[PDB]
Amino acid sequence: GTSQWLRKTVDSAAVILFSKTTCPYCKKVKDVLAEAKIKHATIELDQLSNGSAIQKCLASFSKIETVPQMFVRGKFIGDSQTVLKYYSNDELAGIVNESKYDYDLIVIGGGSGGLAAGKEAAKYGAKTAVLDYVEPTPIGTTWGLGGTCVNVGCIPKKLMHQAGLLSHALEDAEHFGWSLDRSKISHNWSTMVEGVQSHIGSLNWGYKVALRDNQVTYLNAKGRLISPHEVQITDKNQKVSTITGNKIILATGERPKYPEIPGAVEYGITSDDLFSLPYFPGKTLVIGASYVALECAGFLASLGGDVTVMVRSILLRGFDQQMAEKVGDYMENHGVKFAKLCVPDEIKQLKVVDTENNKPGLLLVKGHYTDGKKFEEEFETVIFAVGREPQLSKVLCETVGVKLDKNGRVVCTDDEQTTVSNVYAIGDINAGKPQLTPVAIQAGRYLARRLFAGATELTDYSNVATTVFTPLEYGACGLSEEDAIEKYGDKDIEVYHSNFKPLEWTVAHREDNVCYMKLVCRKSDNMRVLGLHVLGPNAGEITQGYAVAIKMGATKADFDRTIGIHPTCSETFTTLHVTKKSGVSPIV
């Protein structure tokens, strides 16, 4: 262990200091490096069990066994006496800047993962470049630094979801004794959009400042890996140039798919366009049944929209199907219409989008049902949410040797390594991994720590918790019921479940037995919780704490002996007793 770890650490770290907490010579270097503003990784050997073994192994790299020992890019440079001697002639700055490449790290893609990796790498003194370019949508929509998450993903989505939730809050308020007014109140799409885009703008700038303050070179350019250490860039003026980097992190993310039909690219929009849309969508058709499709359709209906969802087969493919049905049922009972077992054939333009009046055009949607029957209806806006795809053919030359799977995603090892050794991939482009922001963040941060700070900790991709932000939120963590049954057998699976109602909904006169939760369990493994599922308000806030417990290997008994907090929705998980095999109704 010790031998292998040290070689890899020395060869990969840009600037690293092997040290002990109780040393005046180590402190003299630390104070010098802080004064010269030279960022570095610090390994306190007296804080490690194999610290004494490492010192003897350090002799193979430096000839000495004492501390401190400073290394720059796989090379020993000197001890405390020598480092302070270099600092005396003002030569140390040039030594730590000496490199074979332009950068220790090039990050292609300035999104969640890419920014997390870049910022973390810079902490330990790696010269880092972050490349970001936003290719315009068919209709020319572009945005700033931050990736999908900040600009056209989680952030604007949840803000518009909140705007939708306040519709219900306005209704509830009367029952709770507030004078209004709810029928005489309307929503303004433009007021909301500008507020949301104003917050997006501050994050765009926030990241630009963060990279600057962490001394990370930000380039607004399109990157292309032409060789393992060479990245071709293209700036705003179409200048083509080549930069070199020791390690390459690919974090280019995904973009929405378009079905191969006439009219789609011309007359339809995606989530990329919706969040900055100058006009209110109006009568809207959402083609697709992903979480994006349902979330978007969800708030649009809550913002006084005539919304139809066109579903090819099932809702939320990949998610628990019982839970998916309940998500849809709520939406259908609160305005959202569904065109079941339906696919589109073409979109004909009936009216052109009025730019100078902030109004949508008009589109004729032609499609067909599974049986063969025809679909024909007029919509003001058609939103495609039919999936998301990586576009690595634009990013990656075939000659480089980075292997991609059937879906065009980068095949990685458990430490994010591509088939090219110095090249890594994180985020949505990493095959088989949950496609979520914090996954990209943990991946990026941890990778940067392993590369430049000698860390060993890998990212755990199992039991990653999710929340679908539909009108009624759906939070999950672990396996679906059908997956657990398939993996272990029906006789080994016990499902505890209960309907419930938020206390806030009682006075507000909202429907009983709409909120549902369940625990999927393995009987032969001391009733181990394999999956947690909650449909209700703040389902994300509910699920999070439990994801830690499931990680630790929570059983049903661990839930039972914990005491609930009253009055909350979440406390219901602490007292579940009704099983599915008993057949007793989950109602309260």
Annotated binding site: 20, 55, 67, 80-81, 112-114, 132-133, 148-149, 154, 157-158, 222-223, 225, 252, 255, 288-295, 312-313, 317, 387, 391, 397, 428, 435, 437, 483, 509, 560, 562, 566, 574
CA distances to 94, 152, 173, 385, 441 from 119, in Å: 23, 22, 44, 32, 11
CA angle 545, 550, 553 (to 5 degrees): 140
Strands (E), 337-492: 337-339, 342-351, 362-369, 374-379, 381-384, 388-390, 423-425, 466-468, 474-478
The answer to whether 279 contacts its own copies (rule: CB under 8 A) is no
> Alpha-carbon distance 276 to 187, whole Å?
16
Q: Binding residue for its own copies (CB under 8 A) from 80, 128, 418, 543?
A: 543
The answer to whether residues 427 and 113 touch, using CB atoms and an 8 Å cutoff, is yes
Query: Which among K ion, its own copies, ligand GSH, none contacts residue 23 (Cβ within 5 to 8 A by kind)?
Result: ligand GSH
The answer to whether 282 contacts ligand FAD (rule: CB under 6 A) is no
Query: Which among K ion, Au ion, its own copies, none contacts residue 515 (Cβ within 5 to 8 A by kind)?
Result: Au ion
Q: Of 33-41, 160-168, 245-253, 569-577, which part binds ligand FAD (CB under 6 A)?
A: 245-253
The radius of gyration computed from the CA coordinates of the chain, to the nearest angstrom, equals 28
Within positions 309 to 328, which residues make up the interface with ligand GSH, using CB under 6 A?
none
CA 553, 556, 558, 564 torsion-angle sign: positive
Closest CA to 285 of 370, 343, 242: 343
Q: Of 34-42, 129-137, 189-197, 234-242, which part binds its own copies (CB under 8 A)?
A: 189-197
The answer to whether 475 contacts ligand FAD (rule: CB under 6 A) is no
The first and second tokens of residue 440, run together, are: 């990209």
Name which of 12 and 42 has its Cβ closer to ligand GSH. 42
Q: Binding residue for ligand FAD (CB under 6 A) from 125, 164, 253, 536?
A: 253
Query: Which among Au ion, its own copies, K ion, none contacts residue 290 (Cβ within 5 to 8 A by kind)?
Result: Au ion
Within positions 310 to 349, which residues make up the interface with K ion, using CB under 5 A?
312
Helix, strand or coil, per DSSP, at residue 409: coil
Q: Closest separation between CB of residue 261 and K ion, Å?
A: 12
Query: Which among ligand FAD, ligand GSH, its own copies, none contacts residue 108 (Cβ within 5 to 8 A by kind)?
Result: ligand FAD
The first and second tokens of residue 187, run together, are: 């929503």
Number of amino acids touching its own copies (CB under 8 A): 81
Within positions 232 to 261, which residues make up the interface with ligand GSH, using CB under 6 A?
none
The first and second tokens of residue 556, run together, are: 């049903």
> Alpha-carbon distance 561 to 389, whole Å?
45
Site string for K ion, 379-398 (x = CB under 5 A): -------x------------
The answer to whether residues 429 and 100 touch, using CB atoms and an 8 Å cutoff, is no
Phi, psi of 522 (to 5 degrees): -105, 115
Name which of 7 and 366 has its Cβ closer to K ion. 366
Query: Which among its own copies, K ion, ligand FAD, none contacts residue 189 (Cβ within 5 to 8 A by kind)?
Result: its own copies
Strands 76-78 and 128-131: unpaired
Q: How far apart, in Å, do the first and last CA atoms of the chain sit?
A: 56
Query: Which among K ion, ligand FAD, its own copies, none contacts residue 312 (Cβ within 5 to 8 A by kind)?
Result: K ion
Site string for ligand GSH, 74-93 (x = CB under 6 A): -----xxx------------
566 is annotated as an active-site residue: yes
Q: Closest separation between CB of residue 48 and Au ion, Å?
A: 36
Name which of 317 and 351 has its Cβ closer to Au ion. 317
Amino acid at 283: K
Name which of 2 and 538 has its Cβ closer to ligand FAD. 538
354-381 burial by CB neighbour count: b if 16+ within 10 A, else e?
Answer: eeeeeebbbbbbbbeeeeeeeeeeebbb
Residue that is written with structure tokens 């006169």 in the block: 509
> Alpha-carbon distance 457 to 447, whole Å?
9
> Alpha-carbon distance 123 to 132, whole Å?
20
Q: Of 112-120, 180-188, 259-267, 309-317, which part binds ligand FAD (CB under 6 A)?
A: 112-120
Amino acid at 385: A
Helix, strand or coil, per DSSP, at residue 343: strand
Name which of 220 and 544 has its Cβ closer to its own copies. 544
List residues binding Au ion (CB under 5 A). 149, 153-154, 290, 292, 385, 437, 502, 515, 536, 569
Residues that bind ligand GSH (CB under 6 A): 23, 25, 66-67, 79-81
Q: Which residues are catalytic?
A: 566
